[PDB]
């Protein structure tokens, strides 16, 4: 670590502190994820082993790049490329005017390019939330913080039961589904898409159940016809409030028809009907391929 000068702390993600820092030799600016190891009863935590090993396999323009892994006395540093801020601080800094809609084509398109790459590599991200969405000054936007990612098998088996930050968690998870795979990431992106337009979380649940009911209020409570199986899922309760699918212009006005189409295909209740990242890329909505420089 003699070749790195820490500039300032950038924040804590899934595990340990991130730093802005400069490569002393080349002057390159990087992010430095620190992992203190004498804090850790289990040695290198599983989240770090997964992130490192997954990101050594994953090289894509829309995935933050792991540049190096450095081990010094009691510490593990992950050297990442530098980007300028997360989408949550960008959104809320532009929360008065809103975020211009050509950038919401750009960012949802790029984010789907990333995710489609992950899924072809059989990686679930499982934490697509704007704080983990980096967007830099050239405008590109990159998936980041794979500390909660998992490689899925063919076939899958039951994985970790509660995953994704609550505002972005898919209904199958809330109901305790035995199996999930790629759909849970697509759901998350929908919550983010509408969070870009409404400049406010589509489902800002304060609880597990409150997140469930935010979903029901907005999409309608599902039934054995829209999602065959719901009634036999473990955490399904008959007592839920039957709500009405509020038109896709109320829950989210700025949208045109296609914005409403795409988003509703991404928020389909049945994981098996919900759109793939590949298909979402082929949706009409991504016909104009805008790439604007943001304000920062």
């Amino acid at each position: 670590m003699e070749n790195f000068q820490k500039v300032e702390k950038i924040g804590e993600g899934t595990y340990g502190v991130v730093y802005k820092a400069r490569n002393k030799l080349t002057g390159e600016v990087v992010a430095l994820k620190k992992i203190r190891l004498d804090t850790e009863t289990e040695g290198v935590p599983s989240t770090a082993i997964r992130e490192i090993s997954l990101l050594k396999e994953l090289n894509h323009p829309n995935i933050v790049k792991l540049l190096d892994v450095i081990h010094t006395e009691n510490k593990l540093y992950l050297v990442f490329e530098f980007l300028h801020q997360d989408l949550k601080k960008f959104m809320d800094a532009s929360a008065l005017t809103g975020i211009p809609l050509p950038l919401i084509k750009s960012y949802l398109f790029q984010l789907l390019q990333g995710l489609a790459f992950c899924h072809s590599h059989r990686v679930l991200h499982r934490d697509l939330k704007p704080q983990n969405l980096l967007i830099n000054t050239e405008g590109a936007i990159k998936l980041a913080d794979f500390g909660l990612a998992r490689a899925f098998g063919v076939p899958v088996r039951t994985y970790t039961h509660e995953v994704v930050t609550l505002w972005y968690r898919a209904p199958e998870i809330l109901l305790g589904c035995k199996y999930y795979s790629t759909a849970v990431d697509i759901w998350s992106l929908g919550c983010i898409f509408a969070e870009m337009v409404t400049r406010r979380a589509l489902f800002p649940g304060d609880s597990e159940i409150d997140q469930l009911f935010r979903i029901f209020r907005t999409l309608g409570t599902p039934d054995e016809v829209v999602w065959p199986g719901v009634t036999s899922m473990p955490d399904y309760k008959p007592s839920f409030p039957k709500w009405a699918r509020q038109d896709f212009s109320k829950v989210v006005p700025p949208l045109d028809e296609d914005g409403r189409s795409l988003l509703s295909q991404m928020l389909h209740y049945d994981p098996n009907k919900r759109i793939s990242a590949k298909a979402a890329l082929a949706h009409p909505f991504f016909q104009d391929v805008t790439k604007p420089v943001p304000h920062l």
């Binding site: 899925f152 063919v154 076939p155 088996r157 590949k278």
Partner: protein, 278 residues
């Protein structure tokens, strides 16, 4: 070349997924002669270590995938070193399993269990030292396609239903554990590392089925697996003579899932019978 056995995939493009899997079989190398870098070690020592890891896996209800991850981490780590003494093998193996369990299991056993099973030979701190030595020597390449994951792919293709949904488990349990039992025997013999993992899995499958099935599910041609098949014949013989083990059940595991849990076989004698025939 190789057939593309995958169906049409709703969640990604089958062509990309398959080419990524085949490149995984390329960039992860294994060396059947790595023990030549360790003149104080014998192949039986490797077999004894791996067999003991299987026993540890069964005690803790670890997945088959965890065992094969540890096997791959052990074999590739040892190929990066020289002159290891037999008193270190237990620590190298148990630290490989520790890494694999942290990667693969939802709630793995804690450090203290991995030390406990070594019956005083390895402390927790020793395991924390060795895990870093392993991961750095392997350059953090810790996502191989294991032998058993290839078997999972093949079984899923074999029993694909109308739905063409390769991600929901659709294969019956008995065929899976029986082929797996043959693979667990073969992997104890370091000569297996001559064959790519997907060919070992295809050859074990073949000895339990037919050329039609093998080609259908793996896309290999008979000439691709022929040497492996021939090599495997005595192991398949020893398993057939002895008879296949029945499906075990596990405390806290649903019976429909129990085939995914690694079992242990006192099969070092089976290994000897198989190699005696050559």
């Amino acid at each position: 070349s190789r057939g593309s056995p995958l169906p049409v995939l709703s969640w990604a493009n089958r062509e990309e997924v398959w080419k990524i899997m085949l490149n995984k079989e390329k960039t992860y190398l294994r060396d059947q002669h790595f023990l030549e870098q360790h003149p104080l070690l014998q192949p039986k020592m490797r077999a004894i270590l791996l067999d003991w890891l299987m026993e540890v896996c069964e005690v803790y209800k670890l997945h088959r995938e965890t065992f094969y991850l540890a096997q791959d981490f052990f074999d590739r780590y040892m190929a990066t070193q020289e002159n290891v003494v037999k008193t270190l093998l237990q620590l190298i193996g148990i630290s490989s399993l520790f890494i694999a369990a942290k990667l693969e299991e939802i709630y793995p056993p804690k450090l203290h269990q991995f030390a406990y099973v070594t019956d005083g030979a390895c402390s927790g701190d020793e395991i924390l030292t060795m895990e870093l030595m392993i991961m750095k020597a392997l350059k953090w390449r810790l996502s191989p396609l294991t032998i058993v994951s290839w078997l999972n792919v093949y079984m899923q293709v074999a029993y694909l239903n109308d739905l063409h949904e390769v991600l929901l488990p659709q294969y019956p349990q008995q065929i899976f554990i029986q082929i797996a039992e043959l693979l667990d025997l073969c992997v104890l013999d370091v000569d297996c590392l001559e064959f790519p993992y997907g060919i070992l899995a295809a050859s074990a499958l073949y000895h339990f089925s037919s050329s039609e099935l093998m080609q259908k599910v793996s896309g290999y041609q008979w000439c691709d697996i022929e040497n492996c098949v021939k090599w495997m014949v005595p192991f398949a013989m020893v398993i057939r003579e002895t008879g296949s083990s029945k499906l075990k059940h596990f405390r806290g595991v649903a019976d429909e899932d129990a085939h995914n849990i690694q079992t242990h076989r006192d099969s070092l004698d089976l290994l000897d019978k198989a190699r005696a025939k050559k």
